[PDB]
């Protein structure tokens, strides 16, 4: 069935936070529809495709957001129904606090068209990077501020809390000059109830232009009642609220997971460097403990272990794998007929050609890496473990 | 002080999910250190810089993950201390479940070097895109599975739940052949306690190669006890657990936010299209209600409103804004001296040159967009509202 809809993001910071694949789909599309919030990103998009439409022109003062979203979605799906490869482009991650992307994709999918959303860099992704926090330690609760209030969503004082749309509390209408955030005090009351007047709240605004610095301003909950401080919270503001305390381990789980030395399970307040610098009353953690120093001393005698798999590929294979990631038309051709595609790629070795003919992950990997004899294959599979994971 | 550390991500899907800015830093760096999980991405990186080191060679069987992380961080910071511009590259978002990035950046920052993490596309970002869910509706709780168990982290049956590292429950050591996930039953017990035996759990694995499809398999909690099903959960598996019910609105908040018609506040089970297709017993929602049809009918008579700001820029300005986003060396030069940089860009109009000299967001925007008279400036500022936001 002719026609496709691919929805992509621009990320938050102008131009640079777009993914390579998002760019390649924008370039390949027959028609591009976009909704972005800075003109440099807009201009950039217009250099990449000749047939773009700005969706922002469908907003209006007093016009219901839902009617705007229905219209934005319909403009995209109308072109899909004509048999065109259509790309929608939205700020950030195009499925994070975005209504028309989900609507348009769901319609396209239900009518039998190819439909896909590509992920992008969200404001929360930026927040993690700029506030130097890992959502994994100690978990992350993420809400829209009005939804948080209206449905009385639970906080955990032991985990990260992230609140979107803190500059738009309770606001229903659209307006081109933004909104008077007159119900912000309702949010502050809730934060006082949950955390206390002296608990920190970090006002976060990611840099939107490449040369700008992020806003990373720590206030007390009580400071948010001051008019001069409240005034700073706008339409691109997010709040990060750090944990008030650390949660203890559960003895039953320690025992069932066989973390057998129970005295040597760390104290709940013990930290792996670095500690969260936004949490109240967190002790300084030593970066170079004797164990760290001993690990560093081992670097002089280091050799890769026997099971390590060196890259052993070719220019031809690297080129084709790159083309498959960066050329949506090549990818579609490959997906339509693995064998015909694989047989038309010049300079591939027999193993490379065979691996591509199959399309199997393991086969492609074994073609591109020297899998050693030492690594006796349990595949007849890997694990990441690059964080403070398990125990 | 000479030297810098920039940590960047590759995203999840091979090559294509790297951001433009991540690529530009990889190309500009004096030394690149990387930890990625597929060889196509590895090969790609090696074509972009002549001085790369694979951090994965510092893992070993039985060697503590913490010693590995200390070593990985130290390898990067050692080069920073020599005055080099160093880039670390990690799978996904480089601050999401990654220890050595945070460690290395914190050390570099405390010793007075330039230090920054650039966000990337995480597994959660992929999950939102592939499962067609918006974390904003009805909020999203995100945990590491072992941490979830050991610290008895709270679930909300009314919000999204995302669990990372479900294939590695309680696992401490590294091993090149992955892990036997023998304590998976401890996770399933907790999920049964919180949600019930018949509640859905979505096993999610994002495509890692461009031609692959994601795994999006719905099981009951009870089905996860079957050995053939449990076996499928591995090191790149994430669980998504949808809400069991919808949460009602709070009358006090409705009243304080002046959502004045109380009878016309939607029923808690009323949905904006599309509904979450993973939730149990969710009714079909009509995409084309009479209100949707009326909105679509208005498209024929549409003209952009008076307050809409058309792009009105130049090739010279678009080129420089693109260069600032995509050339870290140009950006540093610009940041060091706005005026000297701005005065050396040829073909800029006087307004464009002046806007760049200042560096102010508003000034750059007003140089690139026709700000109409109708939009009488409250700036002497915008809001997004592209989702089901406020009310
Ligand atoms: N520059 C910025 N810094 C911090 N938060 C931002 C931001 N831009 C947008 N946001 C957050 O996102 C909300 C807009 S809703 C759109 C979000 C976008 N799709 C994304 O992926 O993030 C804002 O109210 C704010 O909470
Ligand atoms: N292809 C994939 N699909 C779904 N989840 C994945 C994935 N690859 C990694 N993950 C999740 O991430 C964990 C690895 S920890 C590293 C996460 C990475 N920095 C990121 O940004 O996502 C896994 O246990 C799994 O829960
Ligand atoms: Mg989504
Ligand atoms: Mg908190
Ligand atoms: Mg590839
Ligand atoms: Mg592509
Ligand atoms: Mg981070
Ligand atoms: Mg849930
Ligand atoms: Mg720019
Ligand atoms: Mg750049």
Numbering used by the authors:
A (entry chain A), B (entry chain A): 8 to 387, 399 to 409
Please give me the paper's original passages concerning this structure:
Omphalotin A derives from the C terminus of the OphA protein, and it is the OphA protein that methylates its own C terminus using S-adenosyl methionine (SAM).
The structures of R72A and Y76F with SAH do show the active conformation. A different conformation of Tyr98 is seen in inactive mutant complexes (Y76F-SAM, Y76F-SAH, and R72A-SAH).
